[PDB]
Amino acid sequence: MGETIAIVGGTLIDGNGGVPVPETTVFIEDGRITKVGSTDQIEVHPNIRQIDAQGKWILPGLVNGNVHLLDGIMMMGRGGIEYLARFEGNYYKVIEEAAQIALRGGVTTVFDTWNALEPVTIARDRIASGAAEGARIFFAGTLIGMGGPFTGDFMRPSMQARTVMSRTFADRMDAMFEVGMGRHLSTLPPAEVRPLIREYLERGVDFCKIAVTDHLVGLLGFRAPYFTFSERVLDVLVDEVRRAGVPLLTHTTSLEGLNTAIERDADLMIHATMTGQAPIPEETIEKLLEKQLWSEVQPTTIAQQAWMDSVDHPFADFSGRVHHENDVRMIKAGVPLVLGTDAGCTDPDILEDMSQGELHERPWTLGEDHFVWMQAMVEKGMDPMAAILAGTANPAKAYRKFDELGSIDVGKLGDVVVLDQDPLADITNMRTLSHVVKEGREIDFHGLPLSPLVTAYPRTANVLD
Amino acid sequence: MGETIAIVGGTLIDGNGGVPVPETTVFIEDGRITKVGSTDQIEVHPNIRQIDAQGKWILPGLVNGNVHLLDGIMMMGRGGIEYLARFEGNYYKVIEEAAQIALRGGVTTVFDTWNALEPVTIARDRIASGAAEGARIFFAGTLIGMGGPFTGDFMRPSMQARTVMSRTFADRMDAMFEVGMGRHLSTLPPAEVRPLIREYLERGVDFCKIAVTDHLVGLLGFRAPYFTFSERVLDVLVDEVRRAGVPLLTHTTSLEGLNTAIERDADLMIHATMTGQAPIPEETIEKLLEKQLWSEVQPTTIAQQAWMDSVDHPFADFSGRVHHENDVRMIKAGVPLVLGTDAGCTDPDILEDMSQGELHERPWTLGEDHFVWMQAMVEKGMDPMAAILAGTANPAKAYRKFDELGSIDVGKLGDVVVLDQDPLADITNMRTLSHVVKEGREIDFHGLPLSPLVTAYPRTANVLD
Amino acid sequence: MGETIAIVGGTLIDGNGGVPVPETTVFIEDGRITKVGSTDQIEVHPNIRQIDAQGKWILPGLVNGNVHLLDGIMMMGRGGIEYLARFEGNYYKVIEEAAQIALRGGVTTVFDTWNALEPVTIARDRIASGAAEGARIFFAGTLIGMGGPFTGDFMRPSMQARTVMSRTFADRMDAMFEVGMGRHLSTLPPAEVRPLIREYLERGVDFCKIAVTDHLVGLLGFRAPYFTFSERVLDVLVDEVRRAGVPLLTHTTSLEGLNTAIERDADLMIHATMTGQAPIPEETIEKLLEKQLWSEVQPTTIAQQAWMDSVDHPFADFSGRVHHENDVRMIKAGVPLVLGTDAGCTDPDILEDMSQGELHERPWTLGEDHFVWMQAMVEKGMDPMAAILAGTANPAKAYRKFDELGSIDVGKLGDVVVLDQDPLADITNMRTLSHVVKEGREIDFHGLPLSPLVTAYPRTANVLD
Amino acid sequence: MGETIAIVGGTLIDGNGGVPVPETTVFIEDGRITKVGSTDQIEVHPNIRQIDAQGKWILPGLVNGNVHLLDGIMMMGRGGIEYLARFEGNYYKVIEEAAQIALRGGVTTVFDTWNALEPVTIARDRIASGAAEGARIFFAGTLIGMGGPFTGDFMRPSMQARTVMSRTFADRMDAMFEVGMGRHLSTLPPAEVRPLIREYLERGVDFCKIAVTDHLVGLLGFRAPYFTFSERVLDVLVDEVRRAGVPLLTHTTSLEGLNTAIERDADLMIHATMTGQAPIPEETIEKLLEKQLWSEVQPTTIAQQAWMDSVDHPFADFSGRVHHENDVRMIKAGVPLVLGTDAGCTDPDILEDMSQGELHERPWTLGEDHFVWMQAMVEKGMDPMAAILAGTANPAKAYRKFDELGSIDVGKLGDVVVLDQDPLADITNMRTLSHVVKEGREIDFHGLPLSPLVTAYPRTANVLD
Numbered sequence A, B, C, D: 001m002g003e004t005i006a007i008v009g010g011t012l013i014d015g016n017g018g019v020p021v022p023e024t025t026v027f028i029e030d031g032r033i034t035k036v037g038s039t040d041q042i043e044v045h046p047n048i049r050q051i052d053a054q055g056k057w058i059l060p061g062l063v064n065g066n067v068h069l070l071d072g073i074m075m076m077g078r079g080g081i082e083y084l085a086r087f088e089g090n091y092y093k094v095i096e097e098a099a100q101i102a103l104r105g106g107v108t109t110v111f112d113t114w115n116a117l118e119p120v121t122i123a124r125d126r127i128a129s130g131a132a133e134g135a136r137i138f139f140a141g142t143l144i145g146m147g148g149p150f151t152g153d154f155m156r157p158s159m160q161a162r163t164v165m166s167r168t169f170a171d172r173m174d175a176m177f178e179v180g181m182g183r184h185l186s187t188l189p190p191a192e193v194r195p196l197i198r199e200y201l202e203r204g205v206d207f208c209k210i211a212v213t214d215h216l217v218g219l220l221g222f223r224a225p226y227f228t229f230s231e232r233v234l235d236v237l238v239d240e241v242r243r244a245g246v247p248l249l250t251h252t253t254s255l256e257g258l259n260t261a262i263e264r265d266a267d268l269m270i271h272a273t274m275t276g277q278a279p280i281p282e283e284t285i286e287k288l289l290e291k292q293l294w295s296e297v298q299p300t301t302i303a304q305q306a307w308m309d310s311v312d313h314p315f316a317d318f319s320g321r322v323h324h325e326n327d328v329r330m331i332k333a334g335v336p337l338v339l340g341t342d343a344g345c346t347d348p349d350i351l352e353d354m355s356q357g358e359l360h361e362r363p364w365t366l367g368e369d370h371f372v373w374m375q376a377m378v379e380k381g382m383d384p385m386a387a388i389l390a391g392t393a394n395p396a397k398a399y400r401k402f403d404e405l406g407s408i409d410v411g412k413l414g415d416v417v418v419l420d421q422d423p424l425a426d427i428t429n430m431r432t433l434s435h436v437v438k439e440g441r442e443i444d445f446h447g448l449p450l451s452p453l454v455t456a457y458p459r460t461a462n463v464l465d
């Protein structure tokens, strides 16, 4: 799948954190970066495709450490039934479309931390083999110990999908997301858990995410967290994940969940600063610093948060108040940080419901969510370069892919983006994409997605042959 | 549109109620009945297709006075969202499939008293023109003064679809069912109602059904009925319907509603015997007998009603108790009765939820509903011949189509069915279809529907190209 | 129960609409007004109690044409169960306390248009006989054709009390409000309705209120009104009310309901300008003018309405937008208008839930609601004198009590209030009460209610003997 | 506090499990047992009150290891609001009434494992001091880590009290049950949990019950259990409980919860056999046998469980199926068992809702619950003597009160009951009480409760002075 190209004469930001290098040239052959250096210092035979990066900035291909290519954030409110019913038969194409939408924003690698295993496998495999366009996918499959989209984990007091849908359909959806690893694992002794997780890991996942704490925030609010498992069952899960040799992700929503994750040396802790609206103790930050563990955080911009607060939004507490303070203090301490957003490609019927306030700097809008993330983190005092490293090298490191991707270095995959303006002068300039390259192949990124499916709109009631 | 055929040597039950005529032959040319006579009295040039009816019974094509080809009854519980979301783009084909399923049951003409106008129009016109297969369709479009499937008229206290769906989708679905004739009509002065119903009737409906009473039984139960309109607004609606020259249907759920419908000389009174679990007064029945108005009734069988009562079903009061007694008394009195069922082709995911008891002699299962109706009515004392007429000639008379269909008479359309066993001996023998003929064309009815859509099952999550 | 007193030397506003008379004296003997005229012109032997009305204004005792002394507005949202459970055993005392709270605001006569018959009878009879303090009560008992507080008439989609209370208690409350005249009347033929309403009227009510339209606004919103009865059953009810010789009240929520009420010559039409957010036609206003019928209207102040609109309040449409326009146009046409508010004495636990915006110029706060009403109507262009007549003579006339009360005239009951400042200069000066007299007895109105019950607060968990 | 009496000539079942000792006499002085011996071996100076026990059986005062004197089980369905609103002001008297109803059933000591702290304190102290009648009370106060009756811990998907009640009342009720030890504890670091539980234990509780697992079965069913706290927070709680010198109780709803409780050497494990409908592993039972820890279990009888299954009751899985099998296996293994029921004195309006089947051998009906427990356990194979010990000596042992009560031994409190029939011959004969003695004082137990409060019925709407 690799091709050959040269990105010529731009200011290079290679993702290793150093001072940027002007008039630099990147040379990619057969997918891989072979030469990085000064323009005058190396030659481009004109049988070779070139991009003119003069006056422009060269960055590695962007990396999102947490997306849902079947839109999971939606399923936690309105729209789950209609979306899943509408696209049954085509989930892998929904996933490919979402990957393409991510690619349209410069993101060449996505890490999907919750999805239905079958279609995300199909889509990853098709994208890897050139059979389909889109960002490179690595996935967890399901979240261990969490129920599917029609269980309590996606209910609200006034929103209970199972009251208005067939049990059969609901069960069929819950099964394709749970894959046998749902809430019932909490009823089992450790020796019955071990084989189930061992078998699950043999199914081909790139990493494993465990629900250390509950996923009941839609039902109970933010200040009543639980643990999904006893700690010895949790340790069973963790040990089997280590046996399988894949990275360990955690889902936590309390201070004690966070500490518990830290003491398991999690490779990546998803929304680590979501802590039941209780402030993270200095001790916990000191552990993150001593152990050099990666925390993913999911912030809101000043504007989005203010809008949320202005309408008493139900998820105003997800990133607001004490969690905002957590983000600020984590930044100021210099802990290892990873970009992730829970973003997905939201159904247009649900988008059409939304006010302009809801849409402006919306954190879950796949394709723009990473721009917004970097903006929000910089609004909280993060250094623009660190913010770029967060969306580039850091997730590669956390997921153990930094030998293949995440920085522009010889031997690594030729994923690259070119920006018209300086992202270190203004982080919103990350939006100023003009070229996108994946494995040395330049992408017509403005013409993505190739075959609109979810994003096809408006919708015709009776399509005539 | 029409073809030529002859049905030979069967006992004729012609639909006019007379003594059955043995060793009879029916001859059809270009869609029209040209000869009815004794067998040995008419030659069949044997280049002409023949059906050997010896030892068999010949009936007119069956007629159902009330169906919903988009399954409305379903939308009054679980399944509306998934069903409408899954088949958006294809509603007319859902309707054609249901029409074919009706045809598979011996029904050559269906009267649809609530549906979405655009797709039922498309389907009717394509079936009429030969572009699609199915029973002949006549329709009301919407019910004047009723809300769409995501309004109060389909809610239950613990079933509120709008709480878990996008407003945009809900609104789009309510608009294609309401077509501007929803609950808001109840807020208008008469002079502003007039143009809306005038314009509605210009959209090509075959008849018009008015909500004399409410449709809130799902929300409030059976003992709290309302009137939808004032008397003078009702005067406006009725006047405009009569001026458009189409039959007037009514929806009534109370004794006063029924009386109000009788006083307007309604052409057909849908579930006339549903009257708030209050018994129909003798004077009302005597009004029905004197004005000779058609009542559609929707009974349950003994087994079904008993299952319903056993599991304390929400709609046990639809046809149970006082409504059963109403049915019995209407039968004994000999009022004019019409077969109708509110049946539709139910989504297989919803059917798969059902127990054997729910499914057995289920009244809303399109394709078997009319058999079950006749069984149920004969269980209550109806004369089998009367029941057969209720499902052939009587609907045609009520809808003013008896000049074209509903009996086997010279000049009428050549819609015919053949049974292997005597329906007058045992009404369940209506199920023993061996031949079905529509407008002279014999139908391969065991092979319907042609292109399973709703009824395609099981459903595949990811269909590979 | 009458006593003797003289109100000396104040500017008299007698309620007949004329220019106010300065230096006037009102002389009451044994409950009745015996002399009204110039101060110099008549003598007060000093064995006689006097109030010094110098520099002050003399008005008749205030009259509220619509209250609920068991707080009905509350039962339509949160708090019904706890209130009714807390005060079972003492409803007549709740009612007396509320009457006393009305008296504290200058209101000497209240008309209660929905309540539980037994306790409102007990309280009226006790207040009339001196056994208990409070405003004079006249009542309807229940609203004919409406369900009790635990039926659909007080439900909202997210508020269903019967899901969390005993059926037994709920039924017991529904019975004491319905008194057999609930929703089931809609299921009956006219000849079965007649005796039930005839019997109900023999139970001792002062007037009868009929639910011409539905009471489902909490469940369905404002733009889906129904009629409770067929018009001939409605006419049965109306005729029996005329037979009984008591005033006819109507509840309407649509233009057609309003017209229907008008064509029955209703003595008082409660919230007549509540019309499904459709504008009242000129023709309907012309009928009100030609027939000189009384309309009660329930407006909001500019401030309260703005607050409601600022928080998307669920009952923002009760008096806002088109209904505001209705009020304005009714005022500008000069139709006969009556003050009423649906106000009650709200449980303090429910008041404690409320923001300051909700409480400021709240229309349903018994004891201040009439001040607010007059303010709101004057904000809409009503003449202050007409606004005073609306809360004084007009309800007396509508309910046919103007021969006994509602104006200061010889022969009438000696109900009087004294104000410190001029209500014709600023209508909020209606708040400046300094004396209150009922049947010639001066009231220590600042010390009401005598025996706090509902208003007793805070509430002690364990009261020790 | 104590009195003097003698019980003469009965078959003694003393609570220590030995062979029953015929023609025995028990002698009590100033509340204390001083003599147990053969009849003809001890003289009764006949100025001393006597109970003729000839032909009768003498048992220790019965003991219930788990009740709720404010009826908690009720609050998990319908009735919480009405019950708490109706009796605010009088909670301690509700508690005393329930204690008296326990006493009416032969129960002289009750252990209340969830209640509101203030009123249960008041009631315990007044019963202890002679100021009120009833069983001796020992209490936990609240359940550490559980929400109050208007939190998620008492919700069902279609039962959300807070949707129809004032926030103020709900909050006030949640505060008096939680006492600051609610769900928010799960958000805290260990060092901030420590002072709260330290201070909680200083408020005078007799023991402390910890929510090891969740209390969301009403909301999520039985197969989705969680842990309330991390291991180290649980360490803090347990450490502080042990340091306060009171018994440690646990609430567990999973196998891992049960194992976690066993590993902490809990003094009593409440509904130990409720384990997510997953069978208890043999190794857990063997742990119980080796550590000899007390398990409270809450079974259903055959009839009751069968009624429950017949009507598909929400709590059929509380004691049915795998939990029944757990009970059976625990009985066969001979683990230490304690009688407890979660029973309370249920509001008569709620009882009046119930069918005969619901009421028959109902496990939560205080005053009969312990009889039903013993019946249910003997139905599962328990030895009647063992069952009797489960309801006398065993709770006293688990709560560390066996030095004072639970057997008839010299030095212990003179709590005694007399039966007319042999409970070892048929366990239902535990119902044949003829005498009840508390601390030497014979109780007029047929005359309890003294002052019906909750149980006063029917309820009068308007009580005239």
Ligand SMILES: [Co+2]
Pocket (backbone or CB within 6 Å): none
């Ligand atoms: Co060269």
Ligand SMILES: [Co+2]
Pocket (backbone or CB within 6 Å): A360, A361
């Ligand atoms: Co912007």
Ligand SMILES: [Co+2]
Pocket (backbone or CB within 6 Å): B360, B361
């Ligand atoms: Co059958």
Ligand SMILES: [Co+2]
Pocket (backbone or CB within 6 Å): none
């Ligand atoms: Co004199």
Ligand SMILES: [Co+2]
Pocket (backbone or CB within 6 Å): C360, C361
């Ligand atoms: Co003010």
Ligand SMILES: [Co+2]
Pocket (backbone or CB within 6 Å): D360, D361
């Ligand atoms: Co029994």
